[PDB]
Design an enzyme around this catalytic site. Structure first.
Site, PDB file in Angstrom:
ATOM      1  N   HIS A   1       0.853  -1.224   0.000  1.00 18.00           N
ATOM      2  CA  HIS A   1       0.000   0.000   0.000  1.00 18.00           C
ATOM      3  C   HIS A   1       0.878   1.259   0.000  1.00 18.00           C
ATOM      4  CE1 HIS A   1      -0.113   0.713   4.534  1.00 18.00           C
ATOM      5  NE2 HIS A   1      -0.224   1.971   4.089  1.00 18.00           N
TER       6      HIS A   1
ATOM      7  N   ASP B   1       0.218  -7.268   2.392  1.00 16.31           N
ATOM      8  CA  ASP B   1       0.627  -5.838   2.333  1.00 16.31           C
ATOM      9  C   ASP B   1       2.143  -5.775   2.534  1.00 16.31           C
ATOM     10  OD1 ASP B   1       0.524  -3.098   1.991  1.00 16.31           O
ATOM     11  OD2 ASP B   1      -0.122  -2.704   4.077  1.00 16.31           O
TER      12      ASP B   1
ATOM     13  N   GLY C   1       1.443   7.578   8.320  1.00 15.17           N
ATOM     14  CA  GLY C   1       2.829   7.961   8.004  1.00 15.17           C
ATOM     15  C   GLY C   1       3.809   6.952   8.567  1.00 15.17           C
TER      16      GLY C   1
ATOM     17  N   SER D   1       3.266   3.705   7.999  1.00 14.22           N
ATOM     18  CA  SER D   1       3.081   2.581   7.036  1.00 14.22           C
ATOM     19  C   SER D   1       4.401   2.134   6.377  1.00 14.22           C
ATOM     20  CB  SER D   1       2.067   2.961   5.989  1.00 14.22           C
ATOM     21  OG  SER D   1       0.772   3.034   6.550  1.00 14.22           O
ATOM     22  N   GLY D   2       4.625   0.818   6.286  1.00 13.38           N
ATOM     23  CA  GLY D   2       5.810   0.221   5.633  1.00 13.38           C
ATOM     24  C   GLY D   2       6.979   0.070   6.587  1.00 13.38           C
TER      25      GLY D   2
END
Ligand SMILES: [Ca+2]
Ligand SMILES: [Cl-]
Ligand SMILES: [Cl-]
Length: 223
Positions: A40, A84, A175, A177-178
């Site tokens: 994502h 994801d 923010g 994410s990942g």
């Protein structure tokens, strides 16, 4: 990160910032040429930023390297956020050191109760908005498969796990994410999704990295 603490400059040496003119996602350095992030988080024109504490100030330990190649998981579903996970290869190998270091992949899935470290430059407020320029950290237990499914009926796959606090106040946020979930020196999670942030009975949901090691090793081996 909500309810977290200031990590300390370069204390999370595997924490990368993904930049497209601005930090928009986290990532984890897993070797000199490869980053793991959230599918994502995918877009083009990614520069990977390593050695970063303040993403607004050149402090002297940074390595800036463009993405040569991005590989979203073959079975990534953007509606369900199932699988994801995404790999980003760098144009050149980073110089590994005390401040820029790979994190080890899991040889085994971690279990609920295990303490983990979640980091990122995401929002610090469960209600309203405020972004930190220095990296934030949160220590969080992995929650049971069953308490995860209770919190999020019909939504949690075998490739997700919850971590954090059902009472709320402490979560990842927009923010983050990942970004990493490191548990006992091993990358077990990717900051994936959630219902708001740090809300009662709505903990963080994380990509289960132990499912994906085969794919990561095989992919790095041929790209
Ligand atoms: Ca900086
Ligand atoms: Cl602090
Ligand atoms: Cl595979």
């Amino acid at each position: 990160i909500v309810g977290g603490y200031t990590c300390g400059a370069n204390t999370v040496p595997y924490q990368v910032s993904l930049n497209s003119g601005y930090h928009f996602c986290g990532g984890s350095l897993i070797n000199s040429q490869w980053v793991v992030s959230a599918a994502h988080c995918y877009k083009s024109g990614i520069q990977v930023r390593l050695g970063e504490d303040n993403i607004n100030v050149v402090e002297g330990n940074e390595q800036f390297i463009s993405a040569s190649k991005s590989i979203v998981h073959p079975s990534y579903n953007s509606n369900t956020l199932n699988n994801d996970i995404m790999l980003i290869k760098l144009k050149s190998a980073a110089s590994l050191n005390s401040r820029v270091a790979s994190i080890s992949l899991p040889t085994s899935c971690a279990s609920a109760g295990t303490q983990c470290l979640i980091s990122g430059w995401g929002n610090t407020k469960s209600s309203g908005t405020s972004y930190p320029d220095v990296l934030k950290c949160l220590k969080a237990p992995i929650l049971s498969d069953s308490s995860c499914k209770s919190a999020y009926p019909g939504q949690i796959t075998s490739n997700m796990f919850c971590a954090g606090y059902l009472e709320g106040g402490k979560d990842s946020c927009q923010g983050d994410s990942g970004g990493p979930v490191v548990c006992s020196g091993k990358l077990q999670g990717i900051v994936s999704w959630g219902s708001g942030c740090a809300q009662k009975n709505k903990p963080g949901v994380y990509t289960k990295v132990c499912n994906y090691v085969s794919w990561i090793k095989q992919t790095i081996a041929s790209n």
